[PDB]
Paper text:
Herein, we report a simple, high-throughput, low-equipment dependent, and generally applicable growth selection system for engineering amine-forming or converting enzymes and apply it to improve biocatalysts belonging to three different enzyme classes. We found the specific activity of AtTA(wt) towards (R)-1 is only 0.038 U/mg, which is almost two orders of magnitude lower than for the benchmark substrate (R)-1-phenylethylamine (2.9 U/mg).
A total of 96 colonies were sequenced and led to 15 different variants, which were evaluated to yield two significantly more active variants (additional H55R and V147F/V149Y, 1.7–1.9 U/mg). The PLP part binds to AtTA(RHC) in a very similar position to PLP in the AtTA(wt), and the (R)-1 part fits into the active site of AtTA(RHC) very well. According to the docking results, particularly the F115H mutation precisely carves out additional space in the substrate-binding pocket to accommodate the piperidine ring of (R)-1. Furthermore, the H55R variation offers a positively charged side chain which provides a hydrogen bond (2.9 Å) between the guanidinium group and the carbonyl group of (R)-1. Therefore, only three precise mutations have been sufficient to significantly (>100-fold) improve the activity of AtTA towards (R)-1, enabling practical asymmetric synthesis of this key chiral amine intermediate of several drugs. The best AtTA variants were applied for the asymmetric synthesis of (R)-1: AtTA(RHC) produced (R)-1 (98% ee) in quantitative conversion in 5 h, while AtTA(wt) only gave (R)-1 with 8.7% conversion under the same conditions.
Author numbering:
A (entry chain A), B (entry chain B): 2 to 322
Write the structure that this text describes.
């Protein structure tokens, strides 16, 4: 049980960061706009950027934990794959982007962070001018680590519903493997969950199978096997990490079509995402999940995920001086 | 045939406007941000606005022609309806908003313009925040009139394809009656049309029926009757004007499910939108539409639409002094 150790470390680092605020203007976050570094709350973008006027963009969000970047290359590679699918190009060389990110994290002093990169079409749409001519825009920022499930809730588990008033945008309309900020269905899902007295929405494909939630992938546990949707979802880096850990532990993972009915007969449920890690679900549609306690396989995955944050194969330490 | 006089009047007013670009800092557009007026190219918004970070917003675009606002009340009413659907509230009273828009157009000096109003959730998302704490943001701007089809192309008609690599987002994922900037499918359709040697994409509902395109509604003409999709599309104010004109002329309009097959067997096709008006389509999937000339019913609708811009029931004159 690593929860106590992981969360006590975070609480201690948070107190040190809070002490810095009156002396460090970047302690609450730092942004890169047009090559200049500014405090996050002061960052501004042009109103006419097509990332605002058509959400014509992609983004990605690696993280820093205890001063160690977690799987940064995997996130940059995914960002480049998303850009390719949208006919965008990352505006700076990949090695230069990584040094800028490390430099931003060091200036902020933040040890537990989310690091967001956004690539937009730019100030003009393609139809007026030839594509090579158009100029894509890049925005980057570092912020204190964000929780889809707060630490004290991970100790108990959260409540979820299978959404009935909304379903996930299908891949032949918007490709969910392209990480994006067009959250119309996901925001509807969050309002529905609150209306029904629960915290998290699980969205279907509108054809009796599960996809993904408002900012996380979904994993079901049944008879010692993990199940998680293949089509219709982001290929999450936390999900990839869950697969690495399960394979090291000898637990089978099936990435395939997951019927909605399995969610009502399984042994454990958890969500996974970079903004929070491994997040247990213990009631679904108001009913306890197999008794309502956090399950043994969820616990083993939770411990294994956080151990990977100190493994040289998945992380590297930032020099803050 | 009013095309000659409508287009020649626009050309004359445009020549006057462009002559003033070095003396009038607002001749290329004016924006309202946090109560301050600025040139449109200088307008900036906070990077953390949820209208950018989640496209959590709705927008509406009323127009000014020849110094006359067209159907402004209808646009404001639609924007209020979209806000109610998204649980957003317009920040200022409607009468105040109309007064600001008139002041901005008068300051700009622009006779022909598109006026854009955007309402966003705000700096913070609802979760973890007081409902009182949440504060919706308002952005407004006036820009020179935008043409989805330029005047010279309207004289001959444009080229369209029925999209095969993308379909429209369905209403149970994102409600298309809520005017929005989540254009992922619409942008895919624009790239597909260009790849196929055409300009305009017509998107299906992914169930063998037509919806709308990348910024316009779709109207088919067959045996003296107009057909236009009911479900899955924005309820356009130009489409409403088309219906008014058809009824005055004794032409039947059916607002209903429109099978994809009718597009290959109809007598005329046109698109309609506030950014351009009535836009004929004379090539579809590389084939002439019924001989390839602009049809007679399209021509009557074209003339009737522009005549409404001088009818006091649908328009009012702006005081530029
Ligand atoms: C829609 C969606 N699905 C899944 C995820 C989880 O992806 P990752 O583990 O790479 O953060 C996210 C993360 O933000 C997300 O927004
Ligand atoms: C998606 C979409 N459909 C239809 C329309 C036409 O609506 P209106 O005639 O009200 O401008 C627009 C206009 O911008 C649009 O963006």
């Amino acid at each position: 049980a690593s929860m106590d150790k992981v969360f006590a470390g975070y609480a201690a680092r948070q107190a040190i960061l809070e002490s810095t605020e009156t002396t460090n203007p970047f302690a609450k976050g730092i942004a890169w706009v047009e090559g200049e570094l500014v405090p996050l709350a002061e960052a501004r973008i042009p109103l006419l950027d097509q990332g605002f006027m058509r959400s014509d963009l992609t983004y990605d969000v690696p993280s820093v934990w205890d001063g160690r970047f977690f799987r940064l290359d995997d996130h940059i590679t995914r960002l480049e794959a998303s850009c390719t699918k949208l006919r965008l190009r990352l505006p700076l060389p990949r090695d230069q982007v990584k040094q800028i990110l490390v430099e931003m994290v060091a200036k902020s002093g933040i040890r537990d962070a989310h690091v967001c990169l956004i690539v937009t079409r730019g100030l003009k749409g393609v139809r007026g001018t030839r594509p090579e001519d158009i100029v894509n825009n890049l925005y980057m920022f570092v912020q204190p680590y964000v929780w889809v499930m707060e630490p004290d809730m991970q100790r108990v588990g959260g409540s979820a519903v299978v959404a009935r008033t909304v379903r996930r945008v299908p891949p032949g309309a918007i490709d969910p493997t392209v990480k994006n900020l067009q959250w119309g269905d996901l925001v509807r899902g969050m309002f529905e969950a609150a209306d029904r007295g629960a915290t998290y929405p699980f969205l279907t494909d509108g054809d009796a199978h599960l996809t993904e939630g408002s900012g996380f992938n979904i994993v079901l546990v049944k008879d010692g096997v993990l199940y998680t949707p293949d089509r219709g979802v982001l290929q999450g880096v936390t999900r990839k990490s869950v697969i690495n850990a399960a394979e090291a532990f000898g637990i089978e993972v099936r990435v395939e079509f997951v019927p909605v009915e399995l969610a009502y007969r399984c042994d454990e449920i958890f969500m996974c995402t970079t903004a929070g890690g491994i997040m247990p679900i213990t009631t679904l549609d108001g009913m306890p999940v197999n008794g309502g306690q956090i399950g043994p396989i969820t616990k083993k995955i939770w411990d294994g995920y956080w151990a990977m944050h100190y493994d040289a194969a998945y992380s590297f330490e930032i020099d803050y001086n």
